[PDB]
Amino acid sequence: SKGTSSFGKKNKRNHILCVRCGSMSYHKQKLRCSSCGYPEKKLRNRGSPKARRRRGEGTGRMRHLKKVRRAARNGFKGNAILRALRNAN
Amino acid sequence: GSRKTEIIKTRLSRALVRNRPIPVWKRRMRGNTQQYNMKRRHWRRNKLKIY
Amino acid sequence: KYTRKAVTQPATGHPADIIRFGACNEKAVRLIENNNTLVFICDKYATKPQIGNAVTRFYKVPVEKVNTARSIKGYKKAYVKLKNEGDALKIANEAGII
Amino acid sequence: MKFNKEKTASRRKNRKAHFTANSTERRIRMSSPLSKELREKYGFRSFPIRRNDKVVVMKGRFKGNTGTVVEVRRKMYKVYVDSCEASKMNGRKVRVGIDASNLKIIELYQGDGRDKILERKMNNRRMQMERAAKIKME
Amino acid sequence: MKIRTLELREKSVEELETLAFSLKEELLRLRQQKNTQTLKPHEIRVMRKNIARVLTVRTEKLYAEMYEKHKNDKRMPKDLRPRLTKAKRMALTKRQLNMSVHSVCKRRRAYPRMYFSYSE
RNA sequence: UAGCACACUCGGGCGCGAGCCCCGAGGGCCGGGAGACGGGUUCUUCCGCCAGGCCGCUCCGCGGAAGGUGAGCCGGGUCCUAA
RNA sequence: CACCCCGGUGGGGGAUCCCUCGGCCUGCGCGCCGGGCAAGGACGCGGACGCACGCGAUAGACGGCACGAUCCUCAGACACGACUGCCGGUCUCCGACAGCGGCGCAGCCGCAGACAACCCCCCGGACUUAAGCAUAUCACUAGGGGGCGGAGAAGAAACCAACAGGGAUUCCUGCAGUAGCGGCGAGCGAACAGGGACGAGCCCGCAUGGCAAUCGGCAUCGCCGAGUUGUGACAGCGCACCGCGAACGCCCCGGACAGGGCGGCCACAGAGGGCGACAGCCCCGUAGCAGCGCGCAGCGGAGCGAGUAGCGCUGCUUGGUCAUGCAGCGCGAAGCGGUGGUGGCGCCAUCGAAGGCUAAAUACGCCGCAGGACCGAUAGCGCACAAGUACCGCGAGGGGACGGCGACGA
Ligand SMILES: [Mg+2]
Ligand SMILES: [Mg+2]
Ligand SMILES: [Mg+2]
Ligand SMILES: [Mg+2]
Ligand SMILES: [Mg+2]
Ligand SMILES: [Mg+2]
Ligand SMILES: [Mg+2]
Ligand SMILES: [Mg+2]
Ligand SMILES: [Mg+2]
Ligand SMILES: [Mg+2]
Ligand SMILES: [Mg+2]
Ligand SMILES: [Mg+2]
Ligand SMILES: [Mg+2]
Ligand SMILES: [Mg+2]
Ligand SMILES: [Mg+2]
Ligand SMILES: [Mg+2]
Ligand SMILES: [Mg+2]
Ligand SMILES: [Mg+2]
Ligand SMILES: [Mg+2]
Ligand SMILES: [Mg+2]
Ligand SMILES: [Mg+2]
Ligand SMILES: [Mg+2]
Ligand SMILES: [Mg+2]
Ligand SMILES: [Mg+2]
Ligand SMILES: [Mg+2]
Ligand SMILES: [Mg+2]
Ligand SMILES: [Mg+2]
Ligand SMILES: [Mg+2]
Ligand SMILES: [Mg+2]
Ligand SMILES: [Mg+2]
Ligand SMILES: [Mg+2]
Ligand SMILES: [Mg+2]
Ligand SMILES: [Mg+2]
Ligand SMILES: [Zn+2]
């Protein structure tokens, strides 16, 4: 009753895909992601010290940041076509 | 379950195309230490969390 | 108002972007011969008028109806029925679909 | 001693630099000494080995053999010389991989712009010897 | 590298737009032959890459053209300004940081920097 | 060792191999067929197996290769509001 | 016969030892996010491509420059540039709007979101210690909220002092476990000096009146706007920045010489790594070697700070004690005021609050670099491996295991 019989009724799925963080944590009734806190503007304060190691900055692709490290290393010379045009004048 | 949103089916298709063995020409590459796909997923043993 | 983006990329929606290829399956051959219908595998974001406009542009034949189905294998299968009779068989030999 | 603090004497970092060297560096690490007849002409100690280089084997089983370089493989660092071979079971003759340090170049290939690259190292060696001659003169 | 960049510099920007559309068509004919027949393994590779090569030369010519159009503009387009950093774009200029009030100007003018050496 | 199939039976077939796979016969038994949620390719075809299936398997929800989901009218959105 | 013990061989398992492209620690360097769409995510992208990693419809090397002959499993590609390196392009979609705000504003902009080690502001525990416990302690911590930056904050005295006086801040030393606070219990606990690092000072307001001399915007030397409820000032920057680098032969053993033996050689190079055993001379390297320029102009200077200071009460805080700081409320100043380890009053002494800015010394993770009396696969990071992966949890979250043939020639 309390255990094995009651697990047959667990066919609802409350936490669905979050559109911000992509974890299966967006609640349907609550309309809030339990992981990242969407749709609050700021990110939810992560519930563990390891949660930054899993989900924080640097754990993803860092598509813009890897470009701006490379430009900062070279001195922010920017677009190579426009670099020669500013140098001629 | 035959009624699904667009997001559910795209995630289900992405899980399906992923679920395949290593292509057999990869076993002849040098430095290929992989013999079978350890991330193979069977539908009855391993569940997907696509809700 | 000055333009903020001076250098703009060319727009999408080219017919080669929409159509990946025409299928040579056992089903697709049966649709070419019996139903005057080509089967194209297309981009999954392509709508029915965009797919039909691509077939009229790239293969230069008028299109009666477009049926689409997003496959579970990842792509969008599009069934393109042509207007003129015997014409899908005329396309698939010239296009090399069969 | 190495007085440059910015370069490593660390074994771990030197070993990682050898096995994860990129292809431009792996070409340099596969250098081979010249003969004395090449060193009177070119002057430099060694040069990176290339296909179609004539080579005498200096160490190993094939020591004393001469042959052309028929295959260089940068990953696994192995030079394959013509007439340094071993058969498989099915009679197929396989070239045996020799390290570039065990080969001495007898005749340098000069075809695909390599004569430019040899002369660039030769002239920079000659120019740098002129500067060190003037500095020791002064 | 079937289409070389040397030939693409001669074409104009709209001439490269038609070339990328024509090359996209041939890629669709190549993807047809890959499904129906065999192909040399990198034919789709090569045609995909020279579409990218035509479009890059199109972009590189267009950055050069749009720069000389809006060079002496009051507000250049954001494409043609250097993308430093949002913080570095919002920085005060070196002229603005050197701005000082009149009393700091008169004092530096009336008591300028002296160049001297001491010895005992 | 505890334990694990113990309403089936007979003949035939394919097969290296058969109590269980297939066919025919006999004897019995009970649900079966459509939707949702949930599953996600398990569907279907071809090939396989000396691995998995509380035994065995030539079989399979297994392994491999494929194939398959077509809508103005069905369901949802492009509609309406309920709490 | 079984059973047991000892040994041999074979199993079984993975200890030991040796190894190590990993960790850890320390130092140094860097300190650069975002509507130009970030962090993160979703989905796609390879001829044969699952995972990993890379990438974005220009989707598994697109361009420029440098490099110069391989990449490879097949097929193929390749001096019309393979493999690479550096930089730049392209860079889907979700994710920063009921948006909010500035400027006369045909319009142009900004804020949001990330980062959470360092730093600033607010909020603020309890376990714990007191051998119980309530004040105290833990602790003005943890934690939560907000906000920056490459540092931040602070900062040119309403200061310290009591001397023959010193002279911004920050940091170190030191005062000092001291004065002091404290159920005067447990415990807590500074400051001036002296010495040092580093050094740096400035500004707004009450600016002309023979004329706002000032600024913003534009489609620009002319409009429009701001503004008299008052606008007004230039001393610092930049470029260049290499390619080469010495010196070894023979014999023995061995699968192989880097070993042994003999004989040399180079060294401003005998650091280290690779190479079929342990290499100064085989290779990569190592020691060694290379700079500069361009700027700085003018016109006010006694301006001064109020619902404050202070007092009273309250709450918090502090070592701060008849109040150290902070706040709220009541009262509410002055031309003189504040302060003087902090009761009141008087002296004398010393400063000028209630406006603003300010380098350097100081702190610090990721990351990069270099080191180390560190650990050496149950250790060291959770991860030397398709590790924040597999996997589990409705969820917040939780989180492993797994290294080794050889001359990669057979
Ligand atoms: Mg229920
Ligand atoms: Mg519910
Ligand atoms: Mg469902
Ligand atoms: Mg189940
Ligand atoms: Mg594009
Ligand atoms: Mg449909
Ligand atoms: Mg039994
Ligand atoms: Mg039964
Ligand atoms: Mg059914
Ligand atoms: Mg079936
Ligand atoms: Mg079996
Ligand atoms: Mg025994
Ligand atoms: Mg183990
Ligand atoms: Mg560190
Ligand atoms: Mg983007
Ligand atoms: Mg390229
Ligand atoms: Mg913010
Ligand atoms: Mg404790
Ligand atoms: Mg106690
Ligand atoms: Mg106790
Ligand atoms: Mg107690
Ligand atoms: Mg910043
Ligand atoms: Mg500051
Ligand atoms: Mg305390
Ligand atoms: Mg003024
Ligand atoms: Mg040398
Ligand atoms: Mg007050
Ligand atoms: Mg006084
Ligand atoms: Mg006193
Ligand atoms: Mg002041
Ligand atoms: Mg071990
Ligand atoms: Mg471990
Ligand atoms: Mg449970
Ligand atoms: Zn979320």
Chain A nearest CA to E69, separation (Å):
12
How close is the Cα of E37 to the center of ligand 28, in Å? Answer: 104
- Separation of CA B49 from chain center: 14
Chain B nearest CA to A77, separation (Å):
40
Q: Would you state the structure tokens that stand for residue B25, as one six-digit string?
A: 């020409």
Name E10's Cβ contacts closer than 8 Å, sequence gap at least 6. Answer: none
| DSSP label at residue D35 | P
Chain B residues in contact with A15 (beta carbon < 8 A): 51
Cβ neighbours, 10 Å, residue E40 = 9
Q: Is E110 exposed, middle or buried (0-12, 13-18, 19+ CB in 10 A)?
A: exposed
Does residue D106 contact residue D35 with C-beta atoms inside 8 Å? yes
Question: Which residues 41-80 of D interface with strand G at a CB distance below 7 A?
Answer: 43-46, 48-51, 58-63, 69, 71-78, 80
| DSSP label at residue C4 | S
Q: Phi first, then psi: what are they for D41, rounded to 5°? A: -80, -50
Beta strands in A1-89 (DSSP E): 15-17, 24-27
**Residue C91 and residue C37: Cα distance in Å, rounded?**
10
Does residue C81 contact residue C66 with C-beta atoms inside 8 Å? yes
Return the axis-axis angle of helices C26-34 and C87-94, rounded to nearest 10°.
130
Pairing of strands D66-73, D93-98: unpaired
Does residue C54 contact residue C43 with C-beta atoms inside 8 Å? no
Return the axis-axis angle of helices A80-88 and E43-69, rounded to nearest 10°.
30
- Residue B26's identity, in one-letter code, is K
Chain A residues in contact with B47 (beta carbon < 8 A): none
- Cα Rg for chain D, rounded, in angstroms? 18
Asked whether the beta carbons of residue A85 and residue E67 sit closer than 8 angstroms, the reply is yes
**Residue C87 and residue C37: Cα distance in Å, rounded?**
9
Can you give the resolution of this entry in Å?
A: 2.9
**Residue E55 and residue E48: Cα distance in Å, rounded?**
11
Q: Would you state the structure tokens that stand for residue D109, as one six-digit string?
A: 């290939």
Where helices occur in D30-95 by DSSP H, the ranges are 36-41
Solved using: cryo-EM
> A residues 39-68 near E, CB within 8 Å?
68
- Separation of CA C93 from chain center: 16
For residue B31, give the nearest of D17, D74, D75, D20 by alpha carbon: D75
How close is the Cα of D12 to the center of ligand 26, in Å? Answer: 23
